[PDB]
Amino acid sequence: SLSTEATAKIVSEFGRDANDTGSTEVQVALLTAQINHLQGHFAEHKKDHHSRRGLLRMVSQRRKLLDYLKRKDVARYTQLIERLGLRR
Amino acid sequence: MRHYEIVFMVHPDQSEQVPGMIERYTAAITGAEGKIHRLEDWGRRQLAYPINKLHKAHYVLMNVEAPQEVIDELETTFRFNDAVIRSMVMRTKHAVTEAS
Amino acid sequence: PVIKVRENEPFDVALRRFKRSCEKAGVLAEVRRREFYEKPTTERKRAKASAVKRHA
Amino acid sequence: AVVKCKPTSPGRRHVVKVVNPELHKGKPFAPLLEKNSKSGGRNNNGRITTRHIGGGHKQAYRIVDFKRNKDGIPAVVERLEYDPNRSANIALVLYKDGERRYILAPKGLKAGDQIQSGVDAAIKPGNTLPMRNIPVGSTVHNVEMKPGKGGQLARSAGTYVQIVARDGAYVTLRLRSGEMRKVEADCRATLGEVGNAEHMLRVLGKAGAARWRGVRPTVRGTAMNPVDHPHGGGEGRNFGKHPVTPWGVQTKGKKTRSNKRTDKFIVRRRS
Amino acid sequence: SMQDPIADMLTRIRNGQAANKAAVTMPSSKLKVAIANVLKEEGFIEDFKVEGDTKPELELTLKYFQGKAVVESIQRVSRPGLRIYKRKDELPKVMAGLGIAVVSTSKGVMTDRAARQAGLGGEIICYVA
Amino acid sequence: FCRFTEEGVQEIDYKDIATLKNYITESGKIVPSRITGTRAKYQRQLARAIKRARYLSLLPYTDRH
RNA sequence: AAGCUUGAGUCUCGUAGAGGGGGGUAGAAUUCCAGGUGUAGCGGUGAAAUGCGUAGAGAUCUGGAGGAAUACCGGUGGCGAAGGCGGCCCCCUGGACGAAGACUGACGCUCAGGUGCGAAAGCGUGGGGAGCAAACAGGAUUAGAUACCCUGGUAGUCCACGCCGUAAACGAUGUCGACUUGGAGGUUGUGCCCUUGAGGCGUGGCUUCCGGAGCUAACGCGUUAAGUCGACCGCCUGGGGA
Ligand SMILES: [Mg+2]
Ligand SMILES: [Mg+2]
Ligand SMILES: [Mg+2]
Ligand SMILES: [Mg+2]
Ligand SMILES: [Mg+2]
Ligand SMILES: [Mg+2]
Numbered sequence: 001s002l003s004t005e006a007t008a009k010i011v012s013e014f015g016r017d018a019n020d021t022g023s024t025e026v027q028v029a030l031l032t033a034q035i036n037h038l039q040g041h042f043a044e045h046k047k048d049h050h051s052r053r054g055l056l057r058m059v060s061q062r063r064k065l066l067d068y069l070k071r072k073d074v075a076r077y078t079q080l081i082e083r084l085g086l087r088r
Numbered sequence: 089m090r091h092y093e094i095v096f097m098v099h100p101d102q103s104e105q106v107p108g109m110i111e112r113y114t115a116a117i118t119g120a121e122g123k124i125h126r127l128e129d130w131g132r133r134q135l136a137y138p139i140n141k142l143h144k145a146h147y148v149l150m151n152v153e154a155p156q157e158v159i160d161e162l163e164t165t166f167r168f169n170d171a172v173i174r175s176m177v178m179r180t181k182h183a184v185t186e187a188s
Numbered sequence: 189p190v191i192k193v194r195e196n197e198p199f200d201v202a203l204r205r206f207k208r209s210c211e212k213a214g215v216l217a218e219v220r221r222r223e224f225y226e227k228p229t230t231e232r233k234r235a236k237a238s239a240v241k242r243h244a
Numbered sequence: 245a246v247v248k249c250k251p252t253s254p255g256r257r258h259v260v261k262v263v264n265p266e267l268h269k270g271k272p273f274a275p276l277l278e279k280n281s282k283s284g285g286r287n288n289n290g291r292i293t294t295r296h297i298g299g300g301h302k303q304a305y306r307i308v309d310f311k312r313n314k315d316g317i318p319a320v321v322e323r324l325e326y327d328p329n330r331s332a333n334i335a336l337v338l339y340k341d342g343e344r345r346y347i348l349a350p351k352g353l354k355a356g357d358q359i360q361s362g363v364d365a366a367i368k369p370g371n372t373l374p375m376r377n378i379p380v381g382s383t384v385h386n387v388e389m390k391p392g393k394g395g396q397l398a399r400s401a402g403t404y405v406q407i408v409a410r411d412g413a414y415v416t417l418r419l420r421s422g423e424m425r426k427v428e429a430d431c432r433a434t435l436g437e438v439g440n441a442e443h444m445l446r447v448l449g450k451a452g453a454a455r456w457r458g459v460r461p462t463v464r465g466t467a468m469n470p471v472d473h474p475h476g477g478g479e480g481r482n483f484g485k486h487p488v489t490p491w492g493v494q495t496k497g498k499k500t501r502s503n504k505r506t507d508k509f510i511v512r513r514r515s
Numbered sequence: 516s517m518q519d520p521i522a523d524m525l526t527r528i529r530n531g532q533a534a535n536k537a538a539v540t541m542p543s544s545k546l547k548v549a550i551a552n553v554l555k556e557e558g559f560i561e562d563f564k565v566e567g568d569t570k571p572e573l574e575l576t577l578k579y580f581q582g583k584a585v586v587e588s589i590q591r592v593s594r595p596g597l598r599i600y601k602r603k604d605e606l607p608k609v610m611a612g613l614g615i616a617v618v619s620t621s622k623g624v625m626t627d628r629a630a631r632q633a634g635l636g637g638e639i640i641c642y643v644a
Numbered sequence: 645f646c647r648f649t650e651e652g653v654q655e656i657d658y659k660d661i662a663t664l665k666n667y668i669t670e671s672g673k674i675v676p677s678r679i680t681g682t683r684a685k686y687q688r689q690l691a692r693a694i695k696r697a698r699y700l701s702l703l704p705y706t707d708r709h
Numbered sequence: 710a711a712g713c714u715u716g717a718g719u720c721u722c723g724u725a726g727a728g729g730g731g732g733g734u735a736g737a738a739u740u741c742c743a744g745g746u747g748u749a750g751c752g753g754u755g756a757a758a759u760g761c762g763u764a765g766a767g768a769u770c771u772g773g774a775g776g777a778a779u780a781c782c783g784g785u786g787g788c789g790a791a792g793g794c795g796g797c798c799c800c801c802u803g804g805a806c807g808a809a810g811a812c813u814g815a816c817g818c819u820c821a822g823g824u825g826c827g828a829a830a831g832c833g834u835g836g837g838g839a840g841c842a843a844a845c846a847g848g849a850u851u852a853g854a855u856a857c858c859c860u861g862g863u864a865g866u867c868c869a870c871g872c873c874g875u876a877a878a879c880g881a882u883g884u885c886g887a888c889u890u891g892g893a894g895g896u897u898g899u900g901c902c903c904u905u906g907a908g909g910c911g912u913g914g915c916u917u918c919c920g921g922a923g924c925u926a927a928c929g930c931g932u933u934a935a936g937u938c939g940a941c942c943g944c945c946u947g948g949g950g951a
């Protein structure tokens with residue numbers, strides 16, 4: 001699924017002064033990474049429907065978070081997408 | 089690197105040939121720098137029901153902590169080698185070291 | 189239920205033992221169940237009924 | 245994969261294109277290529293021998309290796325190519341010493357796959373080995389009947405032959421038709437299925453395609469005159485005569501196996 | 516969602532009245548506190564007290580005079596789905612005066628009667644009897 | 645009465661033949677948790693162990709074969 | 710404009726699970742193929758007949774070949790949004806739930822349209838085909854028997870990638886959030902107190918039955934409401950026609 005060490009690394013990359021662990025941006029990044037990981041699986045296992053629903057839910061959550069960020073402050077939102085490679 | 093409990097059955101006449109086989113297996117796991125936890129040979133044991141025609145089988149137990157690749161290789165070997173009849177590959181959790 | 193006859197033991201007693209073993213197994217009941225195919229739904233309903241009966 | 249064409253012309257309507265994008269576009273390998281002269285269903289006596297043959301695009305021969313005599317050497321796939329000679333696809337394989345060979349394409353094979361011919365070869369689709377080393381049960385293509393003779397069984401696209409019995413010198417192979425037959429365990433056989441399963445899903449679409457394929461039109465006996473074919477004649481449509489060849493041999497069940505040689509090796513006929 | 520707090524509070528109060536609870540505890544607000552104070556003034560309840568810094572909890576002590584609940588009927592007219600705003604002369608008289616209405620009056624939240632006396636209208640929150 | 649709970653073990657292993665044979669009948673059929681008095685997860689574990697044994701042909705599927 | 714944690718989230722350890730998808734494999738049993746032993750019937754029903762069987766069936770032992778489903782465990786057991794999902798084992802993976810804690814700070818709820826999932830049967834190419842079994846055939850039964858019953862038996866049931874998009878898809882109870890005397894339990898965890906022993910203290914999540922307040926047309930539901938409120942939708946407005 002997603003490694004503890006990997007999560008820690010992500011936190012280090014994104015969260016402010018590493019003390020933060022539940023940052024919105026961080027969460028979004030985590031979601032994205034797992035989607036990317038799972039994309040190959042999805043391509044391979046085309047009929048895996050329950051699993052698909054999970055990631056759909058995750059995707060939705062990510063979208064919501066992005067929306068929240070957007071009107072809160074745009075610049076940071078933009079920055080986050082820049083390093084991520086998220087389209088809009 | 090994941091914990092792997094493997095117990096396999098060997099042909100009754102191929103009990104003499106398995107020490108070498110055991111050593112080969114050991115080498116294989118050492119190749120990928122995996123861990124060997126325990127090894128217990130129950131020897132020639134009379135089966136509860138006969139498989140094909142053989143009534144007695146050579147039982148071998150082994151606990152591993154290795155990557156997927158070597159496990160896959162082991163499986164392939166098992167599929168190929170008719171001396172080792174069947175194996176029970178299994179996932180385990182934490183350090184399992186003690187037999188009997 | 190493979191049953192063997194002991195020395196210093198009557199035939200009737202052996203028969204009785206065999207019967208007991210059979211009862212323990214529930215082979216006849218299983219056969220009855222499998223005699224005709226049961227729809228899963230029907231089986232579930234039966235189970236529910238049994239559960240209801242259990243409550244007294 | 246399978247491409248259903250948009251029905252622009254009435255010709256292009258039903259055409260189902262079997263498209264493998266993995267295939268190499270351009271020139272086939274030169275020294276492994278030879279002349280394929282079309283005969284048009286005619287023999288030495290110049291007479292039509294087998295009807296409804298001849299025409300279409302000029303074909304070039306591929307010396308596809310079915311013997312596989314280079315034992316103990318790994319072979320890596322250079323590039324997968326098209327073959328007009330057979331329904332199956334062909335792969336050009338680079339050798340570690342330095343050789344190209346045309347081999348029949350396996351199912352689980354792309355560009356850059358390592359295979360091996362010989363006794364010491366391990367389990368992998370594309371590996372060629374004698375049946376006395378093989379585990380019984382698996383699906384096999386490119387199969388020899390006699391030792392060192394050359395692969396003769398399962399060379400059409402997508403085909404495979406399962407192994408059913410092991411009896412020392414002989415091994416029973418359950419064929420694609422279902423006819424179980426005993427083959428000697430010393431003969432070479434290539435593990436896996438043929439690498440064009442989707443070939444059967446192809447629709448030619450039009451008479452033109454058939455003609456290209458090299459197949460002339462087929463006149464129904466019932467249409468022919470009573471001189472030309474047994475099913476001939478009749479005012480309007482008439483048939484009141486049991487279905488036979490152009491030569492008057494029943495063609496609705498009349499079994500014609502009279503080999504009498506290899507019939508000992510045959511275990512059980514097809515269903 | 517936790518959409519209406521006032522309504523929730525009212526519901527809690529009703530439940531307490533039904534089940535004969537001595538004290539009802541609930542999440543607190545300033546407007547809520549004001550409402551409670553108003554209720555106390557009117558004479559429906561014994562005493563109210565808010566306690567909590569991060570999570571404020573309003574505790575309400577209920578009366579059961581002569582073996583029966585004092586707050587007989589307590590229902591919102593103004594709602595999150597539909598808000599009711601009333602003019603000064605348009606203000607209701609709940610159960611012919613014998614019973615009251617909680618009104619969001621612009622000069623402090625209070626009784627309908629009080630609002631009338633003042634000369635000011637607004638949003639009619641709840642109907643209390 | 646559950647013995648496993650009394651013992652205080654993490655996993656019921658297919659190695660111990662003596663414990664597993666007490667929880668199946670002579671013919672080769674598993675005894676319920678309602679008769680033995682076992683916890684449900686533990687029962688499941690036991691069943692799994694039995695299955696494993698059967699696979700390995702340690703304890704039989706059927707006593708006549 | 711500026712802030713808060715309880716709502717809603719994410720992180721640390723775990724928790725069990727028929728949660729999926731993909732790949733392997735185990736057993737029994739049926740069918741069939743082959744052979745060995747064997748002889749007069751077998752099979753079926755309420756009773757019979759069709760059937761199968763003097764060619765040797767059924768019976769039965771051995772050897773196989775296969776296709777499918779997983780006895781026993783298995784329990785108003787569990788998990789899933791539902792549809793559903795039960796041999797076992799691996800790979801990929803979703804989610805739930807919890808415990809201490811850490812952090813984000815309303816990120817919440819519902820949802821017209823919209824999108825995805827959606828038992829069965831069916832449909833589509835390709836497979837696969839043991840049983841079962843529409844249709845179909847014969848026998849019965851029958852006043853008749855297009856049925857119920859028997860012997861048989863194709864599609865289908867099984868996979869592969871698609872379509873279909875309906876079920877009494879039913880807890881006949883929309884979804885979420887809040888509150889209100891209880892019990893018997895079961896299930897699934899977990900933290901303290903000397904666990905002085907399976908256990909004790911309580912104390913959180915999950916599901917089943919009885920039932921108080923209440924409610925309703927009653928039946929009944931009943932802290933998982935059909936109760937007391939709020940949000941939001943969806944839908945009804947006599948039956949038939951439809
Ligand atoms: Mg022709
Ligand atoms: Mg034609
Ligand atoms: Mg003519
Ligand atoms: Mg003629
Ligand atoms: Mg005519
Ligand atoms: Mg005629």
Ligand SMILES: [Mg+2]
Pocket residue numbers: 814
């Ligand atoms: Mg803040």
Ligand SMILES: [Mg+2]
Pocket residue numbers: none
């Ligand atoms: Mg279906």
Ligand SMILES: [Mg+2]
Pocket residue numbers: none
């Ligand atoms: Mg179909």
Ligand SMILES: [Mg+2]
Pocket residue numbers: none
């Ligand atoms: Mg029938």
Ligand SMILES: [Mg+2]
Pocket residue numbers: none
């Ligand atoms: Mg009939």
Ligand SMILES: [Mg+2]
Pocket residue numbers: none
């Ligand atoms: Mg409907």
Ligand SMILES: [Mg+2]
Pocket residue numbers: 878
């Ligand atoms: Mg249902």
Ligand SMILES: [Mg+2]
Pocket residue numbers: none
């Ligand atoms: Mg409905």
Ligand SMILES: [Mg+2]
Pocket residue numbers: 919
């Ligand atoms: Mg009740």
